[PDB]
Symmetry: C3
Subunit: 401 residues, 3 copies
């Protein structure tokens, strides 16, 4: 019995959760009285947290013991717990599952959790430009965690705004949700609106990305995968970076701007000397990082989201963000970008309006700015995640024997 799974993407260092930005629907998790925070504030949870993800208008936290906590908007079921008591969504609450959870992901109105034996649970809903499309069945959200139907243990989950990707232990990439911009990587453009002529149920059941064998026999398998808001990056076993999804501002790293429905081997990412280890993306920009402590951006320049300095222009190839210290992880919010450094600091850039930058001000930042303030004093940042209008940090007291 009990055959567990692990993965290099799983997080295990215990920490405290801090939130900042907008909190009108409970996404800050600071109760009914705090609707906005200009600087990071502590979210008290009765356990240490190893992972903290920001969805569109909600926040999902994973404790060290495998307990999921959630807060924010539950109108579509994204919290995965009953919030009938007025205000219960404004503070952390438990998502009840029997098994220990080892990784979570969050999109615009959905949340996913991977158990320690590789089963995937999903709740909330997905939506398309026009409206809700359902979750696992056409047109139906789920308020409760529901098991995704698969026959093989999954080692990683990742979410875009309205799609879920699942990497199996054997390297198959299964995708489900909205496929309108080609972010599922397994649906023709013909079936972009609502599964076209072959129903929604095809989009919402987990099905595998099927390519080639960039040799002569097999179908390509993957060693990792990541999502941006409406796009996906998948790294093959050979080390090639495949992109599918929206690229209307060249955010996928393509020369043209049409959406990519069939996964493309991105030649803008081919092994210079950079082993690509982390990808993230908001609606129209991408921030990624290599194995040598460097972060790069591509996509739309407006409001400083590329972090390349004032007067930066649209990029269609990964462009080095030189102004950062050595980098350990990167993340994007809808119009903001972040890097966590190897020495435990966090830098932010992009659209300032929602107070996601942590400068204390609502001005945009075209160059990376180190986030400071009381709650980051004498602490090391472990991660940063960002949604539509808020940002969630995971921190640890900066050790002192």
């Amino acid at each position: 019995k009990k055959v567990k799974v692990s993965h290099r993407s799983h997080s295990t260092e215990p920490g405290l959760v801090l939130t900042l930005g907008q909190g009108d629907v409970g996404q800050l998790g600071l109760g009914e009285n705090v609707m906005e925070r200009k600087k990071p504030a502590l979210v008290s949870i009765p356990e240490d947290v190893v992972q903290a993800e920001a969805g569109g208008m909600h926040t999902v936290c994973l404790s060290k013991s495998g307990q999921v906590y959630s807060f924010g908007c539950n109108d579509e079921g994204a919290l995965g717990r009953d919030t009938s008591v007025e205000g219960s969504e404004m503070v952390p609450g438990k998502v009840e599952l029997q098994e220990k959870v080892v990784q979570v992901s969050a999109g615009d109105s959905h949340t996913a959790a991977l158990t320690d034996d590789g089963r995937v649970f999903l709740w909330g809903s997905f939506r398309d430009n026009n409206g809700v499309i359902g979750l696992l069945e056409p047109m139906k959200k789920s308020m409760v965690p529901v098991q995704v139907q698969l026959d093989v243990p999954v080692v990683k989950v990742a979410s875009g705004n309205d799609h879920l990707v699942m990497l199996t232990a054997d390297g198959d990439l299964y995708t489900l949700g909205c496929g309108e911009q080609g972010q599922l990587g397994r649906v023709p453009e013909l079936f972009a609106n609502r599964g076209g002529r072959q129903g929604l149920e095809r989009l919402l059941v987990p099905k595998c990305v099927m390519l080639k064998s960039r040799g002569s026999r097999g179908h390509v398998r993957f060693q990792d995968a990541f999502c941006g808001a409406y796009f996906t990056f998948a790294i093959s076993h050979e080390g090639h970076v495949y992109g599918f999804g929206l690229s209307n501002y060249h955010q996928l790293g393509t020369p043209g701007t049409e959406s990519c429905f069939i996964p493309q081997n991105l030649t803008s990412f081919k092994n210079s000397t950079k082993s690509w280890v982390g990808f993230s993306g908001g609606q129209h920009h991408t921030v990624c990082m290599d194995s040598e402590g460097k972060a790069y951006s591509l996509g739309r320049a407006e409001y400083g989201r590329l972090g390349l300095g004032e007067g930066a222009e649209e990029k269609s190839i990964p462009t080095l963000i030189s102004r950062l210290p050595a980098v350990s992880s990167v993340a994007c919010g809808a119009s903001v970008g972040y890097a966590v450094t190897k020495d435990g600091r966090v830098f932010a850039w992009g659209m300032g309006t929602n107070y996601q930058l942590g400068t204390g001000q609502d001005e945009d930042a075209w160059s990376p700015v180190e986030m400071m303030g009381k709650q980051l004093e004498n602490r090391v940042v472990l991660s940063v995640s960002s949604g539509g209008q808020h940002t969630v940090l995971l921190v640890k007291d900066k050790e002192q024997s």
Copy 2:
């Protein structure tokens, strides 16, 4: 006076030694009364240890001060010390070697040690299918550490079951011992049975692997070398991976199952994004790792030794082991595989009989299982090594820097 050598493969972090598995002949180093340990147990060594290696049925520990300690079967002289005292082979004792040693290696019935000035000592014996062949001289084992007659400084030593490889400062690879499966990489089959008519001096006198450099240069030189039970891997200064020795289950990463007597350039390892840093191998399988925290396995699948999940089948190309956290080092025992993670944990997989897996059970593990236990709590694993029926860990109290 003597010039000292060093190498990136040398270990220098002090810790404690723990052992588990079978201990009939003293290989656990826990006394005459402890014949088996299902979970790791502390071994009383009078000094901190920087390297701990498991031979077939013995264990060799290198202290921070350069002293070698040994415990286990001394029938063949593998302990390199006098075990007249009853039960003295079952607890650590000082190897009789007046040198500051900086690296050790162990085989089925032999042990090697590298001095700080690049001289190699060897003790015990080598055997072929047929029986004991001697050590440095034909038909003579050595109960005491004896100096290898080489006249160039050696920077790294590695052992298979019955062979020794020595990488010089200039990148030559000298090999000696049993060459019956091509593991010396310099002996024709036609003379691999104890050298045939030419007798054992054709196997036991240190001689160097000679490959006529491609692009007609001199001869190929190497930056690293590792051993499996009956095979050797060597990385050229160009970084090409070469393999020689037993590949009856494709453990060398070759298409056929024929022992390789001539070094092969292993095209299966050629990759733009994977830099090969570590190799290990039991009888019939190989576990290796790249520079990006990923471990791969190849060879025989029986009993779960590949760590690729249930129903895994024989592999002939390095195959990602996805169910592991980021990996820092790998090792194999006869029929078992291990990976130490960057965060200080250790996972095991393969044949369970001997209790080497540290699960507490004797069932095989077809996927990696995390080793737990009271001795591992609040400690980080620095290294893991495995022999026929036991496993040896080097650990430290929850690391401070």
Copy 3:
């Protein structure tokens, strides 16, 4: 708003400064009575130091608080502070500059400093073979810091004996100073027969190295740049190594020995398994390092400066220095080479005359020798930097308690 910039090269870890070698003109910083130190000696600085650099015959230390301390020969203004008082140049003194400096660099007669917002300050003067040429204007040294502001923030500064290179946030390399050996990589035209002094103003103004990009875009841009005494190495965004400057002993890694006035794409550095991350060089040799902890040398072999062992001969391709632990950084002095290990040790090799090797003796070392002594006991080395006849170390107390 004066937006701050950083870079992965900027040093942040507080330490103590040690010096050794010759101190005739104050470069040891130990006062008027200490003219020579055979082993590392502690130099009292009022604050913790994050970066310690050796100029030709001076030393520049950057405090954690952003202040600069200097000591050594101030005949040309390299110290950037008033040493009218007899002996005041023999001990650390503060440079009066109301800026938070985040990086420094030092040459034969000049020092440069980079502010937290990306502006460069330079002082002293540059010389060519025929004498002093000026600093930013012909024939004019500066005893105080002079601002050099480009249209874009500078993220890294690096110095050779008599040239300064600045890498902008946008990946442009701006060079100035002496160009007699091609180390500016930009006015080949001015050195074709002609003396650099005929277009001297053009050389003392910071101007961009302009390389057309083949199957071209505009021009090539760089992710990093380093200097040797009379040459410069720049790594493009694609990871190609470019070099320009002196190569009379093949130290640039060129087949020929003529000085290279245009950036050369060094095919000797092209290799699928090596990613180059660090470069250093004395007059006639180079010591560089890859992303996998390996250090390499090339150039003149006389006096052991390649660290490849006795009888080494001239090298024109990066040649592995096998006899080192895993490397974290490399440095050169005029005729010596160093490597700091990942475990905090420092190794030296090359010409021993000036007592730069830290052996306690003045003999050459043709292979790497670990630097020991009282001041390195129980301490971890953070950096090493070396000039004409002295060497500067930055160390920290072993991280226990």
